[PDB]
Symmetry: C5
Subunit: 348 residues, 5 copies
């Protein structure tokens, strides 16, 4: 008649099979399921989530008589009775773990048990606009149901421990329904653009801006072609860095990969013409690629030196005119593309 004696009696029954007496239909109630994201992967688009629920079903066999046993509750080990296994069918690698080794059983057979579910969900989000991205990620909650025997799951409330897990920030977790009366949790994911804008977008804009004014450096004075080659080799690192944390899957892929690619060609073309124009300034034409006697003598030499100075001046100004013509065309075209490229990344 002791409460522990009552607990021992229920264990000796060994009711390790589900309560399927009533048409093999078990309504399992899961009120106040708590959601939390542990980490979100950007390259693999995988979301790791933790689900802490409070399962509550009915076990008719685990119900004693309140007259012989004057008690209203008793707690038994989880492995001595049947316990449902909640699953996340939408994602991969779902695992359910018992929060505690004991569960509460009431006098009428109702069983209270809390579980913790860790699952990895292959999240699909429109990453066309990195970093300005965000999409709803469905997380399904299901229990085994085969053929005639079905165990419907009833969800009541969802509370989310919202907070950034890194680059991604979780905004909400709402309860919705699927087509065939399937309960799933709609998780809202957003990217904090404070970090990607400063580390990737701003240096890219500043580097391209430095290239536009890099034409101010005179061709003869030097420090221009070497100045531009460092800018170009900096975008090669940007392409490798950017590609290491972004999925180039297919349609609606991140456009910043295309934007970086176009800038690399634009900077290479800018260096290409400057290198050619340097030869034009030094040589005067683009053919490298294609296959009283004493007092009068000094006057002849002095005018010859002046003519040598004059031909240097004229050959160094014709190349400047081509450089000025290209600079006007390049900066307008570059600024037009930069505004258009950025405008697509925020409003398309």
């Amino acid at each position: 008649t002791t409460r522990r004696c009552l607990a021992q009696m229920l264990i000796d029954m060994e009711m390790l099979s589900m309560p399927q007496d009533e048409n093999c239909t078990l309504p399992i109630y899961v009120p106040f399921i708590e959601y939390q994201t542990l980490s979100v992967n950007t390259k693999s688009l995988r979301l790791n989530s933790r689900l802490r629920a409070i399962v509550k079903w009915t076990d008719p066999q685990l119900a004693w008589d309140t007259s012989v046993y004057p008690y209203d509750a008793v707690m038994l080990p989880v492995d001595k009775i049947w316990t449902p296994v909640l699953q996340v069918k939408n994602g991969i690698s779902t695992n359910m773990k018992h929060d505690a080794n004991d569960l509460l059983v009431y006098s009428n057979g109702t069983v209270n048990h809390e579980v913790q579910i860790n699952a990895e969900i292959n999240c699909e989000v429109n990453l066309f606009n990195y970093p300005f991205a965000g999409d709803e990620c469905p997380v399904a909650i299901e229990t085994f149901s085969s053929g005639e025997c079905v165990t419907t799951l009833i969800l009541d409330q969802v509370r989310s421990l919202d907070g950034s897990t890194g680059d991604w920030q979780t905004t909400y977790a709402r309860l919705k329904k699927q087509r065939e009366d399937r309960n799933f949790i709609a998780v809202g994911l957003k990217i904090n653009y404070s970090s990607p804008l400063m580390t990737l977008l701003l240096p890219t804009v500043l580097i391209v801006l430095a290239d536009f004014v890099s034409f101010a450096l005179p061709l003869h004075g030097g420090g221009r072609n070497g100045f531009k080659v460092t800018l170009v080799l900096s975008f090669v690192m940007f392409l490798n860095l950017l590609n290491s944390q972004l999925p180039g899957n297919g349609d609606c892929s991140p456009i910043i990969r295309i934007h970086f690619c176009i800038c690399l060609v634009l900077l290479v073309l800018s260096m290409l013409v400057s290198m050619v124009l340097t030869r034009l300034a030094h040589d005067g034409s683009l053919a490298f690629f294609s296959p009283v006697q004493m007092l009068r003598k000094v006057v002849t030499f002095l005018q010859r030196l002046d003519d040598q100075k004059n031909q240097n001046e004229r050959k160094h100004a014709f190349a400047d005119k081509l450089d000025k013509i290209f600079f006007l065309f390049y900066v307008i075209l570059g600024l037009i593309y930069m505004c258009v490229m950025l405008g697509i990344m925020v409003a398309y």
Copy 2:
């Protein structure tokens, strides 16, 4: 009547249900719980801690008669009797393991058992001032308690194996109480600023300082615009390196990220004007961006060469005046910002 015979008799009872006879209230005593930090993550703000405790509860069923059995203690396997499962409810991924496979049981039912708890706590610390940061991290210790059945947990002492786990240094571990009589361990975390100051802050200050005096290099002599472009590309690496180990979550985010961001723009602007001023020195105006006969002839040539030298001197001094004006404005503004920027990071 043998002690081993007594031990085998207790195992044959199979008391795998908790001692809930007395109103289903089990006071579990946990004196001298020892705490230690294994590692602390800065980017994800996660703290890994190990908790070695000595659980001590009362099992009335596991109590023999000292007359028939003249013994005062006996040790049984942990899996043959009921053992409480201590949890860390505040954090994620809590797991309790048995230090040994045996536990001591006294003649009056008292059971002595030591457990080791490994938990991962999502620590919230004000990282606004990196590296000068530190905050108290709560670690909760709880046992299962559902509905009527409650198992209050009594804690006595906490001893911390204080010591740096890397960048973070653990200072203390004090015992406090929550609102609903919940025992939690208050952990003090501090960042050793010896490392971050030397590896990140000092090179940043020196690079900006070298930029201020980089204006001493003459525009005509060269080695200035190329000198500055290496400094600018160094801060791009600093932004990427710094962003890889700091959480850009939201309000009260690390301000060194903004401080590095401002310095990058300042160096770019300094290089931008220098390239423009170089064109002014070489060209004389900012229009590139906008769309006795023998003895007397030698005098005319000689004065012409002198005039060519004079016009070079005057155009190379007007650009110097603009460079000097900018240097006075830039170095004063830069030093004012640097002192103000650093002052916020230590006293705000």
Copy 3:
């Protein structure tokens, strides 16, 4: 006579041995096996796959009488009866996990159970043309069969959750047959060349293109040998980066590794001749490596200075002729190799 009572009776039978009564031949039916790739490794050529199947066999012992028990189905725990263990014999590290802890048993002995198989397959794909690569990867599904006792596996349908897992894209998963009536799944793997072309191939082409026109820089003006050394040191990084994600196994290894290797030698050879030609321009020969009185005096000095200018001009044009001769030979040879090397990588 209760359904739960029927379930308890079947558990008490303890039928943990396989149904081998009929000639020890168990036909195990596995309809609608679902395939999905979790990740594909390029360097180690290992494919990680998840297999979700619905096993369905016959257990004659687990069949009750529908007259005494008026029920058509019942669910028992998976660990209380015998369950086949599906294997992936082709690959390493195969592990089978039960999706749920319950399985459905019909009145005639048929048992329905769904399993999840995670295996790591050593995939062999012709990676001669990176990125343009793709090959069929066999995945075998087998059940234990030793000596006389054989358990044939019957497969009906395969449905694949096709989608890129990173650099690799899964295209299909078809059901085929091996020699000895062995069922295996043919998995089609393809590499999305959008990423590898942009991050590796395009910068390589642009760098080599910049080297071809780098000969436009005059030898005397400077900024050429230093310009080329940055290009060569950039290819050293490309070799190390490319080698870190590609297997250099043997025959039909990635040819881009050889293509990068040839480009490094070609760019080095271009720098070697340019540095030698710089000495020729400055010195005039390749021997460094080998072991009225007042009015008439000024005329002698003036003609001497003119002759010094003339000898500088003639020695600076002879080196230009050798540079022009090499440039014509180098660009045609470089363009011919670049087109030929790329042509092999796409159509061989």
Copy 4:
């Protein structure tokens, strides 16, 4: 009477409790415990070790009569009898695993069993002199002992599989005793300085040596300030690389961190003065930072050009004198510090 029948009889006894009949004091003999280090972490100062022991205790209950059973030994599964669990109390994450699933039991109750213990020890070593470092690391071996019941452990011999695990080399493993008769293994750890000296110390010495003679480059000729800025940006990488594998805990921290820090300031100061002296050479003062008629005319111009040459010479020599004065002061101070700094790192 069969040996297997005798083995089955001992299993049927189910003696899963410890042999505590004799005053609950069990002398457990562990001769020839073998030690081996798997890996040593330098940044976290954690040592991973493997311990292969041969446990040998006495079980009086597991002793048969040699008359009825004419056998002297028998092997039983480890899980059918009681087996002690050896622990490493000094370190974290201690786990004991059975080498085999069988153990030898003699006719008198003696049981022979070999176990493998993997533990992670928080090693404290004086890393003030990196790489020239080495200290004794204690590894404690303990068995559960609570209250009255104590199981003393007897250790006889220790044999170590000495060998380098990477940067650290294991030298010995000796058996010592603690205060309260506690057995612990003293492990000697040494750092092979062949690797750290070559990868870090030698380039640092060579870079600083190159800076000392970098003053040989003339200020006017160029190639000096740009030469020094590459040296300084190289020490920024050294600080970050060295900080990534060294614990900056507190007192007696690696002094090479400070040595690198001092060298960075020294190189920055060397570049700082050179940039200022370059302005002095070009300008002549440090004020930038602070706020017969035909035949006689040619003589006036010629002497004017000579005077312009003379003033350039005098202003280019005054700055040389300051550069020479600084070079003498800098190279003696640098060599004095370098010899003193290295002397502390080897003999302090």
Copy 5:
């Protein structure tokens, strides 16, 4: 009399102890053990291998009478009978896993069971010549044998799935014998030298050759010391990269590290002497480190300029001669050293 009834009868016997009736000597036959390497570590010299064997022993108790039971084979679960645990004693972290959950038992007691063994072997290979390295790696296979009870293991055939696992290529796996009749598998490991050569040795040789030819650059023209300092920084990066993936244990350590160190010292010395000679050319001596009137006046000025030009020419030619002498000596010594070191790395 049913086959499943026979299996149930054999399971109910509970023969979980070894067949030790006959002198406690169990001959365990393991024919056709299959070997495969999963990965080989170069820095830690650890080999990961997988062993798939077919164990076959004799269990006299598990033998029925063919008259009462007209069957020749039956399959039982692996956990219901005794199964040997094969071990890899030579290496660390040995773990045996059952391929399937069923094993075949014949009418005469013979039991057939296949196991998979994963072990990590501390491989010792002579890495003096990287990448041209290769050595035989022993892998021991053993079963528990303590005191009187010995279970000899008989091996018949070894088949290896040879194939490169990365940088290392497995060549063979032959069966040999140890001193005390111990069976071990001799594994041949070879390094595919194409990848390490192309990634490390060729760039090093090209850089050294570029340094050798860089003496062609004139001292006055500039662009020489920056070239050499970039080469030296690249070689420092090479040293760090090479040290990051090679074990510097002791005697017979990789000599490529010493080769890189010597080459770095040679490059630093070349840069040092180049800077000293540049100072000598600029100054004329190594002392920086050590502590008719109108018509006649013009003639005096011109001869002064001529003398200045002549003294500049001579002070440049003396330094050119010294540079030529050092270039000859350095190129001869460097070629000799390179040939000697390559010969040592290839054939020593």
